[PDB]
Amino acid sequence: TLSAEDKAAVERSKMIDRNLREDGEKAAREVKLLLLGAGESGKSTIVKQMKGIVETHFTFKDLHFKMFDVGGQRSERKKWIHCFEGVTAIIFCVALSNRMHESMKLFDSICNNKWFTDTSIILFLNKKDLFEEKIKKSPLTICYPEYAGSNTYEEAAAYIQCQFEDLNKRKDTKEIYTHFTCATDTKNVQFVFDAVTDVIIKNNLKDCGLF
Amino acid sequence: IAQARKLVEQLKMEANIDRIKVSKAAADLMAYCEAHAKEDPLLTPVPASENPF
Amino acid sequence: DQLRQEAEQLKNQIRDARKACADATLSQITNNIDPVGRIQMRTRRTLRGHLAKIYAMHWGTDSRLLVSASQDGKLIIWDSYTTNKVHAIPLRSSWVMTCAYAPSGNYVACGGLDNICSIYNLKTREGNVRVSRELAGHTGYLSCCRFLDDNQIVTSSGDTTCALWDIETGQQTTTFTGHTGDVMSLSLAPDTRLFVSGACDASAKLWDVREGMCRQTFTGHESDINAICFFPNGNAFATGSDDATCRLFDLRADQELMTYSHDNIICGITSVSFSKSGRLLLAGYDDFNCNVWDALKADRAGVLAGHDNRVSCLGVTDDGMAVATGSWDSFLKIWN
Amino acid sequence: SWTSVTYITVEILIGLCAIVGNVLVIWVVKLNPSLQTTTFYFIVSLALADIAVGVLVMPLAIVISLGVTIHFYSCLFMTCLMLIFTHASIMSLLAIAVDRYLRVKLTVRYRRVTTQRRIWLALGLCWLVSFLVGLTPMFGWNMKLSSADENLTFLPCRFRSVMRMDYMVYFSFFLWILVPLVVMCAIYFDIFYIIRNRLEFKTAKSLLLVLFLFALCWLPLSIINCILYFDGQVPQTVLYLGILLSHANSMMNPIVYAYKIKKFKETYLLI
Amino acid sequence: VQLVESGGGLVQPGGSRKLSCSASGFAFSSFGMHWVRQAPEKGLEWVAYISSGSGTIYYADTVKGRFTISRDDPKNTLFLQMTSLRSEDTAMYYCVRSIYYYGSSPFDFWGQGTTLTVSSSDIVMTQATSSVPVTPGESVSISCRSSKSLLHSNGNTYLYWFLQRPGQSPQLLIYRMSNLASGVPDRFSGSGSGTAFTLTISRLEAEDVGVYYCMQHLEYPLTFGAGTKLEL
Ligand SMILES: CNc1ncnc2c1ncn2[C@@H]1O[C@H](CO)[C@@H](O)[C@H]1O
């Protein structure tokens, strides 16, 4: 039993439902990428290189990416990292040039963190034009006594990469994709595209139980 | 020297308060939640006829 | 030392006097009072249409209209009586963490990680809903916001502060400071003359809206506070925390009155709300359920485990007829 | 006879197991809203197919065996009921396979091509083709088309007395049992090849289990019929065995499809 | 808010025309547009209705099977195509907006109308009078009666109250019962119970002269009253 007005109200509700569903679909074809890391870690460099909260929407190879930079939040209280679940990946930028210990503790924090248990992380050492000149000052023992390798770029860089990878104590579920190629080359986005493609394919398979 | 002076002034402001004993506070909440109980649907649900949901 | 010594001796002696003059806890005076029984509540309506996590929700003053914000960048105004979507406002920023419904019913406020409190006008002559104003000036994320009137709103922020604004001018009339951590929730007093706010510094405090002075501060807590609400008489307030405990304080005794914790509860409280009588404290946890606590006995008077995700937001109508609960599972549920 | 008692006993036990398993799958899917997406749509379609293959086809097979005098058409109806239900289960298996293939090979474009509307449209097309294949015999191909006694109206119901062997072999088996098995085989093999190249023996184990059970249970009776249609003889015991194997795939599907998704396992263990 | 009608004129019997309502200044796309008519000094008569989304189209018994109502949301334009026009289709036609949700006013704004000249069950509501002398400052009480009880199970008594001033289109005074519209002076009030309904005006002013109309929305077709005139 509906009055002359309740039937029009139901019609309005149904029209709103249709609009909500058709916009949620549009919102589900979008790859959400969190951007994290310390200051002067290239975060500003990457956002320009990339094709309050600052959202950069860019399209690459038909994939629409919303990259959220949250470096603006000057409160380091992670009371909003839970808001970034479901993000396809976390792009973590660090600079070789004891700041490194700071970056290590941040990487351990973001990786170990439970909101991001399965979220594969895209570690970056974008720049490569100042990462070699300052290794001739001294080996990786300015604040890292444990290293015993050749004080050259490839040896030390590989050692650092491996030590940051070691902070992954949950590979069973997530993966780390590391990048070193110079930031000047515009391959920072292409590597992000490949990694998100891999993460999505594996998410699909891990969903039907095939994985 | 004023940086901590303002903090201690804030503490002093927090100090000079008309403190009402906790047991007095509990009784007030008890009385308020007792006097508004007969008209609390979620606590004493309305018959289905009047219930808008 | 004199300033450090003065601060230490002050705090110590005020707290010692407060403890000494403390008479009894909340439970000690209500032991003779009978309990409420089991609050068995059924899901009368289920609001479908949100396609992401629901972060904030606020009842309208008519006890029939609702406003809820989702992570999908959508603010839906619902007719709870028929689950008939009244309005769908596309928010400018999809990262929205708070909602408010104007007491008059003409405006709705929202905002989040964008550090802005947007105010939308509902009763326009054009038949749509438009952005009336945007309040800016906070540096940290937007935790909570509540209308004082049709032209005066109060806000809390990760800026470790709060702000009283004048919506017409768009400038923050007053700035309230004193917190050392992110302020996560504020509640407006029934008379709209004070407010209480809890921060990530594991402390709450009562701030006067008129003088902009820090009236009182409350402590005795381990972790941050994510939710705060007044008793319906504005003579007390309850806080929820990641500690996995809820604490009821009085603004006159200046001391914590009661603790709301259970051993099996291991995770924090996302939202807190009171019954129209203030007899049931409803708390949303990360355990995908919502617990009803006897506000005077501290016992669990029931549960609302109809959601398969954490109960992000709670809300009770002004007439106390129903309870809205919103979770990360993208559904609001009305319970009665 | 002992064989009849055993056949009835095994059939009833297998059907009861299938019904319990599929009902548990449906209870688990509905309880958790998290399990309500495309893959779970195909899985629940298979679950309904199996509940039908266990609730009607089991009593119907027992009744066809007892051979009571029950009219030509009532018997033909029971046979066409058993066809529409079994073919539906096989079609649900084929659907799960095609979905997996699309996920791997469409890559990201998959969610943009697979929407709820097309999913309900494909599940519906599957059930419609199952009903068409099963009820076809009542419209021309039946033993009455060859009987010179158009006056045989009441007769003892025997499966070989109503359903022509040439339909169950050329149409039922070679088109709706063998073709699904071959296409599922090719799909899973290509999926494993791609996933290996990109990344893994866990996947290979699961895909093989699936293909093995389905072939292990649907090829037995099919070959029995094929032999009976080329005027070959088969012991009655073997016929009982083929029928039991088919109706056992009906109950086995829940354990080798829904229990391999971690989400489903967690939910089932919680319950 | 602006609703401007067009397409009127003189038409011989047996012809067809299309009244257009070129709306402006509001969200016509989400608005349920009605078509009303007023015959020369005889009163308002509902013509048709189309809801938001074109999901519900209603016609009056007079125009049922003859005349049609079409929406164009992207162009914000209502339409009324009239096929066969008898001598009784001579009237000034109004375009009206109407939005339906809890608490809304479904006849807030009327258009200015357009004239059409032609050569030569349903609830009935009666207005007790048609002319009442009065002077400024003296309170007035209009009234009208209805056949059924407009009070529905919702608790809403779907009786409306419009005022048509000399030489201008009707204006909405009330939309359920005493619920004053937006922009109307607070002096106007409404009341009633079931069948007998009254509109009270305290401190009458010079702009309050005209014809008062009471319509019902409980069931279709919508039926207006004769129109109670106020003299001065
Ligand atoms: C000689 N052939 C047969 N004898 C008995 N039941 C048979 C059969 N061929 C098929 N069936 C039944 O028909 C269905 C389709 O193969 C199965 O569920 C079996 O129960």
Tab-separated table of C-alpha atoms in Angstrom, chain C residues 70-184:
chain	number	residue	atom	x	y	z
C	70	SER	CA	32.269	6.546	2.573
C	71	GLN	CA	35.830	6.070	1.363
C	72	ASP	CA	34.366	6.102	-2.172
C	73	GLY	CA	34.105	9.900	-1.926
C	74	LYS	CA	30.346	9.925	-1.413
C	75	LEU	CA	28.103	11.507	1.229
C	76	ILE	CA	24.681	9.844	1.180
C	77	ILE	CA	21.701	11.347	2.994
C	78	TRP	CA	19.280	8.516	3.764
C	79	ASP	CA	15.639	8.306	4.758
C	80	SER	CA	16.032	5.622	7.414
C	81	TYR	CA	12.237	5.007	7.719
C	82	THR	CA	12.059	3.648	4.094
C	83	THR	CA	15.847	3.321	3.343
C	84	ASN	CA	14.959	5.881	0.588
C	85	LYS	CA	18.172	7.693	-0.561
C	86	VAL	CA	17.287	11.413	-0.243
C	87	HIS	CA	20.576	12.900	-1.449
C	88	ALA	CA	23.919	11.801	-2.892
C	89	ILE	CA	26.645	14.458	-2.590
C	90	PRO	CA	29.914	13.715	-4.450
C	91	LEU	CA	32.628	14.962	-2.110
C	92	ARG	CA	35.606	16.786	-3.588
C	93	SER	CA	38.103	14.607	-1.680
C	94	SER	CA	37.511	10.869	-1.375
C	95	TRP	CA	39.455	10.719	1.922
C	96	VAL	CA	36.696	11.819	4.287
C	97	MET	CA	36.811	10.891	7.973
C	98	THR	CA	34.029	12.921	9.635
C	99	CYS	CA	30.395	13.904	9.096
C	100	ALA	CA	28.051	16.405	10.709
C	101	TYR	CA	24.372	17.177	10.170
C	102	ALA	CA	23.336	20.739	10.928
C	103	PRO	CA	20.849	20.998	13.833
C	104	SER	CA	18.533	23.076	11.629
C	105	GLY	CA	18.820	20.501	8.845
C	106	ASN	CA	19.895	22.882	6.071
C	107	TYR	CA	23.608	22.005	5.959
C	108	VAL	CA	25.971	19.039	6.167
C	109	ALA	CA	29.693	19.178	6.957
C	110	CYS	CA	32.470	16.792	5.948
C	111	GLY	CA	36.207	16.585	5.411
C	112	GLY	CA	39.306	14.526	6.007
C	113	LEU	CA	42.928	14.162	4.904
C	114	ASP	CA	42.437	17.321	2.793
C	115	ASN	CA	42.624	19.511	5.943
C	116	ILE	CA	39.384	21.275	4.950
C	117	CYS	CA	35.883	21.292	6.433
C	118	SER	CA	33.441	21.534	3.536
C	119	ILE	CA	29.895	22.681	4.303
C	120	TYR	CA	27.148	21.833	1.796
C	121	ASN	CA	23.750	23.547	1.619
C	122	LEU	CA	20.784	21.169	1.374
C	123	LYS	CA	17.799	23.550	1.095
C	124	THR	CA	18.520	25.412	-2.134
C	125	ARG	CA	16.081	26.902	-4.628
C	126	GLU	CA	17.771	25.015	-7.492
C	127	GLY	CA	16.781	21.541	-6.280
C	128	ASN	CA	20.345	20.299	-5.703
C	129	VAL	CA	22.998	20.356	-2.969
C	130	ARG	CA	25.939	22.743	-3.345
C	131	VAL	CA	29.146	23.552	-1.474
C	132	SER	CA	28.179	26.443	0.792
C	133	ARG	CA	31.686	27.023	2.168
C	134	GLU	CA	35.118	25.497	2.759
C	135	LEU	CA	36.895	26.127	6.070
C	136	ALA	CA	40.695	25.957	5.812
C	137	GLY	CA	43.566	26.645	8.186
C	138	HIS	CA	44.129	23.320	9.915
C	139	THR	CA	47.496	21.711	9.202
C	140	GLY	CA	46.750	18.119	10.242
C	141	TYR	CA	44.057	15.821	8.922
C	142	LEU	CA	40.430	16.522	9.807
C	143	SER	CA	39.331	14.218	12.630
C	144	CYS	CA	35.886	15.539	13.601
C	145	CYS	CA	33.545	18.487	13.119
C	146	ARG	CA	30.227	19.497	14.681
C	147	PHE	CA	27.836	22.344	13.921
C	148	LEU	CA	27.123	24.746	16.762
C	149	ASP	CA	24.560	26.638	14.670
C	150	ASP	CA	23.773	27.380	11.021
C	151	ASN	CA	26.781	29.745	10.933
C	152	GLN	CA	29.161	28.445	13.634
C	153	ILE	CA	31.016	25.110	13.612
C	154	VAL	CA	33.743	23.503	15.741
C	155	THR	CA	36.524	21.293	14.380
C	156	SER	CA	39.315	18.967	15.688
C	157	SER	CA	42.499	18.209	13.625
C	158	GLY	CA	45.814	16.250	13.434
C	159	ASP	CA	47.185	19.825	13.701
C	160	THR	CA	47.171	18.771	17.396
C	161	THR	CA	44.583	21.583	17.923
C	162	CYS	CA	40.867	22.471	17.492
C	163	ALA	CA	39.190	25.468	15.765
C	164	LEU	CA	35.991	27.459	16.233
C	165	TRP	CA	34.986	28.985	12.896
C	166	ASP	CA	32.483	31.537	11.626
C	167	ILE	CA	30.997	29.999	8.489
C	168	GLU	CA	29.872	33.338	7.038
C	169	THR	CA	33.313	34.964	7.212
C	170	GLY	CA	35.242	31.726	6.682
C	171	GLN	CA	37.900	32.591	9.274
C	172	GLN	CA	38.636	30.579	12.406
C	173	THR	CA	37.270	32.660	15.277
C	174	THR	CA	39.174	30.750	17.974
C	175	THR	CA	42.083	28.308	18.031
C	176	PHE	CA	42.331	25.837	20.920
C	177	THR	CA	45.775	24.369	21.625
C	178	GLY	CA	47.414	22.338	24.368
C	179	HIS	CA	47.396	18.818	22.969
C	180	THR	CA	50.690	17.147	22.085
C	181	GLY	CA	49.220	14.467	19.799
C	182	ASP	CA	46.727	14.173	16.968
C	183	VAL	CA	43.246	15.161	18.167
C	184	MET	CA	40.895	12.386	16.917
